[PDB]
Design a protein around this ligand. Sequence first.
Ligand code: HEM
Lengths: 497, 497, 497, 497
Amino acid sequence: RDPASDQMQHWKEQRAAQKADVLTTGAGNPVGDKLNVITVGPRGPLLVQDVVFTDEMAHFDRERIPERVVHAKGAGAFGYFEVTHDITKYSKAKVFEHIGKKTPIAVRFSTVAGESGSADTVRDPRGFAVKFYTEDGNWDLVGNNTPIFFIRDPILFPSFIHSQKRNPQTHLKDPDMVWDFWSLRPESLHQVSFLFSDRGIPDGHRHMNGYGSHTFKLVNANGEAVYCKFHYKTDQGIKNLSVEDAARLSQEDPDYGIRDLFNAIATGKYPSWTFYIQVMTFNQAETFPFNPFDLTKVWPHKDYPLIPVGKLVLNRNPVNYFAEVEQIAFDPSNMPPGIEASPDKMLQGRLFAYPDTHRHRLGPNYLHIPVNCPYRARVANYQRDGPMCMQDNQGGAPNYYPNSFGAPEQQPSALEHSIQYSGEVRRFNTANDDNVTQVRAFYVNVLNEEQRKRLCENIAGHLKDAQIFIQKKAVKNFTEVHPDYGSHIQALLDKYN
Amino acid sequence: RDPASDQMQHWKEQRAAQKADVLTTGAGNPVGDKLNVITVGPRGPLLVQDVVFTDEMAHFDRERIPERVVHAKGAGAFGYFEVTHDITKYSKAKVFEHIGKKTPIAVRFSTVAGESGSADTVRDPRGFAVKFYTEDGNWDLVGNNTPIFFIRDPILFPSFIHSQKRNPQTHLKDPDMVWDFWSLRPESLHQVSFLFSDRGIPDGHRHMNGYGSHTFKLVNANGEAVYCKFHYKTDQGIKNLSVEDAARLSQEDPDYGIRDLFNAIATGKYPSWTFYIQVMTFNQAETFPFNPFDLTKVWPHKDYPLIPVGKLVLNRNPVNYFAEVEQIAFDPSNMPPGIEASPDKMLQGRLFAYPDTHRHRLGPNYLHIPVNCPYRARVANYQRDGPMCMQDNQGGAPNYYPNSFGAPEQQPSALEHSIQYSGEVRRFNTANDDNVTQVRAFYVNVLNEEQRKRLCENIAGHLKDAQIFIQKKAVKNFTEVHPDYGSHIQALLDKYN
Amino acid sequence: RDPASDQMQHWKEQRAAQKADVLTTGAGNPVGDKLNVITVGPRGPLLVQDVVFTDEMAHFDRERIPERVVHAKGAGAFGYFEVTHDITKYSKAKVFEHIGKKTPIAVRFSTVAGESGSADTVRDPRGFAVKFYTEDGNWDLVGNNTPIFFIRDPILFPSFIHSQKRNPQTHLKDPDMVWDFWSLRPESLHQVSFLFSDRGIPDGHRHMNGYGSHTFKLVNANGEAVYCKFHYKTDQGIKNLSVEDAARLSQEDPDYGIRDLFNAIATGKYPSWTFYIQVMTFNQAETFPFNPFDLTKVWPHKDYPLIPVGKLVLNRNPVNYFAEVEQIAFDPSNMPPGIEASPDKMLQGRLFAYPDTHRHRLGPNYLHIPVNCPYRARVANYQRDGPMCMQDNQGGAPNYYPNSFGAPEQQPSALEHSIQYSGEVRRFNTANDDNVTQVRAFYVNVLNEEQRKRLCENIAGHLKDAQIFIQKKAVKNFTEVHPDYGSHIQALLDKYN
Amino acid sequence: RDPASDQMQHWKEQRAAQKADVLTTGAGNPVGDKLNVITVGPRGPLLVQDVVFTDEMAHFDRERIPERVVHAKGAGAFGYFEVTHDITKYSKAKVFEHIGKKTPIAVRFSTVAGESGSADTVRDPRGFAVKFYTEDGNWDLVGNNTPIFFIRDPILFPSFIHSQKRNPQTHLKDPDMVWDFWSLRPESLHQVSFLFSDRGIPDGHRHMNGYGSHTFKLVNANGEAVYCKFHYKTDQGIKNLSVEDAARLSQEDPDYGIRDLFNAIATGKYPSWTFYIQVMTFNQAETFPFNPFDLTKVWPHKDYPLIPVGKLVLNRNPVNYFAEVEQIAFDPSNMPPGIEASPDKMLQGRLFAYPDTHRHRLGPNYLHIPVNCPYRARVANYQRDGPMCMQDNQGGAPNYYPNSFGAPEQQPSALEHSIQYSGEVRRFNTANDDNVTQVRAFYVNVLNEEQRKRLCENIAGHLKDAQIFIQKKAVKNFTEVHPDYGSHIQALLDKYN
Ligand code: HEM
């Protein structure tokens, strides 16, 4: 059998030659018998003094935590990030200090819209989150398998996710909800085209690219700032499932990506990604034809070539899935000195959203969870007492700042990069921005004829379930991108009806 | 399209001729714009004074509650229970007072081992929980589609569920775990045979029986007590999917039972179940060949014929699934006067487990949730203040008992039925009880030859993935039930290997 | 006896002539007996089937919610706000629509630093929070009994509160912590002088003023904006306890303000406050000698006279304290159209802090708690499912925006007031701003000689416990305010040592 | 100054000669500046990218956990338990294995009815809880400063505590509630007499006795069982405050017992208690004049002399109060092999109540909190995944029992002691048991004349606030105990009226 199937037998074999441990309660008291309950004779009622029973049961009743509101179904792995090139001119980050420096990483792969228990091999954006345990605290690159997203304003994210998930009355997937949203929000055409292309259903997590997707800000030691996009492309090469194979695997193995990643790491075939960046100067940002902070746009490779930085290798599988993968938390706000946020509205919304949801899901002190702890750095601050505190709580150190007792002091070299912003403080409309230019480019330059045909059949297959007016609004947006794109979908829809 | 698909269009049509409501914050303040966020000009960072954003997002970040530790995937419906026969001689329950009395009910159907997002059409026991809103408080008949269960002691339940669910390292379904447990616990042969028969994969929730499974105690107005088993058999008739059809539906519609029940109720075809009981006297209980409180045994129909009581009709679909189906809580401890627990160890464990898990999942004041409230009864007690209290909290009434200020008094007619139990207070072993007699009866009397063949192929298909020694231990137990049963499985396993 | 003592007798008298209600479980099942537990004979162990016991106990074990991190000890009352003057030229708020309009209000009084169970009559700032149930959602004026605060940057608030509360090792009040913070942060001199004056220990909650303390922004229907300060001065007149009387009442009645407010409202003597505003134009704000948004400064009455608006009357006592006073939540972010935030940094920090802590303390759906609900307004939005949801959860309405099914639409008349802000986006230092001018004014103009002497003895009495260097740093700041102020404290400190 | 006041200066002195640590976020990222917030220029609104602010504030907003429903105000200390005598003939507990064996202990002192922030020096039962970190898991002796309690049935405990605490409408202490309960429940006369004697207000926590109060069951290695009462009497001697001194200290130092214990341990004067037991055989239990498991009765010293076991010394003060004292959890159910529960109904109720409330207060995994962990024992079991899991979660070990992979096995030597109980399973009334015999003994044998007078004045002082009929019912119960007791109270009450 595969290594995944032989988990229990491998556990037994690695612990052979030693006697079984004593079964205890949570409080360490030895259990006399855990197969029977205390009764008033053979056919009598259960006693309250059955403390072993009520402890076991009470813990069983409290096993479930809330699943992630998005990216619930997921797969986890560990390894390191190795620097291969010098980018110290761009960033002063300790993760990029010198060549050959290895930082430990934790990664989680996921499907955006699926719940815990949903099939792996389905058409959906794949999450690709990376947690770098840097000497200057944790760095969380929370990325996707696509360089763009559907929307460009963060106030629409809850709407988008509600449309992608189940109907609130029926509890069913509603193509009506999905295509109503997408047809009303035509800045999703670019991400929709990528999603309904061949790379919508990647063959596992080893054969997909990863992107930061956002513009980030690199600051060097001299204090100069540039703009960046992170790319981590697969070294195993891009590889996708057909719709038929994906549909078969959905019933055969709904845990295809968990099994694939576990077996790959267990057999020694460590998957690797090459870490690239694009650099954009402030003058180039001002003279960019589009908004360079627009999450629905990319930076073309001819104008902005990829600069290699290092490689990501995953070599260690999780010991316990719940402890290492279910409880891992990735905060985009976790950025070490040298890396900062850009004015990208979406990124600004993510800076709030993640720590908030982590406090709900995991709890106030979620950063004390081992996988979340910045173990390669020293944390000292005036943050004290909350629920489930599993440190000394910084002992008897003064808990106010400023003070006169040598408590932790602010480091002035870790200040943010200052910038002058123009305009009023109000709500600016971005719905009416360019929605079709880069989509047309992708359609008529990147895709070939058979790829265009498959893209159109995939869209038409999903969109046929929507109402007629929604089909018309969607096809109109596809026609505005390119007339062949719209006409081919319309022809297939007419066939389907 | 089917009624399920037209939820949104039906919502719009029923609310036609009125203008759209004003979009407000949670605090009722009108929202000026909810498509854009406040920035420092067109390409500026997000402001904290964007209260509309942070409210929306904060609520989105806290949408998920913990799924049920078991029976997570589920389907909900509402209707009534109509009394057709007089059983007042057996029970003094207000639910059974007089003929033609209608009590409102809430029902939830489920699969035991599947998570939220798992396929509906899979081989698993189906949950069939019924909440009767009686004048003497709520009655929760928390039943299954099988009259028995796998185990007879409640301390093994967490072990059983852990074996049925995912491996703690790999996060995969482990046939090794499933069949190791079942082979080591041979009192599961009866439930295993039922599960791997044709009724393992029922065609939706309308075409399955329901059983209390436990022995309950009926007390009449005179104070005499008897033993009972609740049966609710389908009026639509038993109907099952083939393995191939089930496997197809798993990828086609993972929400087959939700869709089926919604469409059935929406089109007017209300499903109905006929409520039966078996009665067992205390002398018959003492002279029963088996333990009558053993959850792995049934009461044979020749010795204990079914007595009709009434019918269960489901006529109303949930308005909002989360509010009515996700948040509904069924407590087996919720039993009105006339209905009591028997010495069945399993039932004794359920009396603790459910209210405990409900306090974790939903919260301390989960009985204030509308679907959980005993709205057809008046609650008055000395239970005060907890989190998320949404009543007057019983206003300024004295909060201690006894008192001298006319606070709620105990009703002496609602006392429990007293019984003398013999034997020591200790742990009695029940693993070595009869495990094969009723299993043999079922195999050679109920099943025909082609049903026996399908049963053997279904078991062999699942058990082939287990290690050789586990296969041998399982086949041994099947051989001890019946040699043809064991030999046929063994032949198929040898073919599979 | 006083009305407060006769709560139980009044309850009995108002419910005379009717029989006591039936004592039920939470699920509405009648309790047979609630004075004894089920045992295996007279001297036998307790049974698990004692469901009445375990329900009662389980609820008792979950009674406590987290106290407010600040303003834990508090007193609650209800009444109305009556408009007496027209300020429609300044604000378009429905609360100020027309003369004679009554809006229901909820008020909570409190002590900032005391825990639940601490003495009422102590030297501390008093909280004075007002919740207006306006037709345009709730308005929460979360004020103090002082027009200023200790600090002007919100990042120092957790430090300030930690210094005011107990030592993290000893769990004792530390004058060392208090005066170290205050001596290092000399912008607290103004609030410190007010706190150690006679109005530090008001005689109950009826004899104290209330202030918004922050600059707010009033917007009229025409779209013009001005700046505002809310004052609500007592109609019963300012009245204070001596240090000796306060010290006596601390042991005699630690619940002096709860008793005083309950008896005042119960006897019919309804306390009232007159609602005033100060108005500041944008040109006056630019030409103000100080920062007009500085929370340590006031607007002098000669330059900015008080403009009457209406009166606040409290006429109704809470029915249940836990439900109405412990669970009430005041969000400064809850502001109806016509009222907005100013650039005051402190106010900006409060816009985040309150809804965050409310989600922790009360829970995600704390706005469904009756006292927190905007019952005089209609809430409709795309916020769905969280823990302890006690509404229909907006039934089957579309849960995404924008949509094509007539779901709630944004109201363009409720947009925020736009303003152009100059300068870089960075951290600006405000520690080095004016700290002594208005403090000197207060000391030598408002206070008389005997008031100056009492102020100095109160400061010296508290500050004597601090270390010598902290005393010197504090006296230096007092000397920089005024040499007589510093010299008098120093003389008293030398006497104390 | 005293050691308690010099906590900060001692912290600075012990950390002299090293530079201050770097101030970091929770994620370990260095903070550039934590005195100012990011604004749009000097007088601009706060930015969302102020991640340092929102992290600090978010943690500050979640500092409070729920206080203990009882014994909220408390004081904590650490030390060891030294065995001085051999009781191996009575118990096989590892804590009592051999002479000179030191087990580490954690102790918490408390007042039953006071909230967090209430005065220490008040008339109330004092809690005296001891947590022994034994090699066979934790042992929690959760005791009081009195050998008895007010009630003998655990279903009345929530009523008793509600009566002792604040009125649900007024939020005030109600003598009406207190004396109504006590007058209706005359089995409280014994504990009431002890409480209103001189030992009602002990002088700190060092000058009070400690009692288990319950009958426990000692089992030896041979398998014979006896009954036990634990006594731990002070080596510093019993010492009490007068009513006047206590009333003074209530305003002067509400944290008198925290200060006293901190200074005592800090100066080196380690307080000590001598551990005694009483032994009662099963034949003596059957022939005892009273119920030997009655919590309102004691075992007289002439019939049952004290047997020395060892001494309890407290030598270490808590480093951080929140982490070590607020979060410490004591479970009476935590009993190592050799120590078991008796049929005492109260003890039976405590076996359920404590682990339930701990899951609410601290969380599901509260035993992972360092102070609660059984660090001197090895815990291995089939309890997995809950919120805030801070272990490996037992890695990849099989999570079901029984299994075939060498997972932890039950130890048959840790079985409970079996006993045959007679009688029906129902509710037996114990309200009508003897209530006055031992109370009379205490009154006329233990107390002298001036002690009797002070007892009567203390009762009369508290009871004067109750209504006339409650005074009459209370005095009647005191008269039934002894006519001089009742007549003296009545005379003082008549004087007070
Ligand atoms: C039916 C009887 C009783 C019930 C239901 C009960 C219940 C409780 C509860 C719920 C707590 C709060 C624990 C926490 O949340 O941390 C508690 C604390 C406490 N109880 Fe009891 N109790 C009972 C009887 C007694 C008796 C008889 C004693 C002493 C002889 C006692 C001593 C204490 C002490 C000392 C604490 C505080 C423990 C600590 O230091 O954290 N209780 N009890």
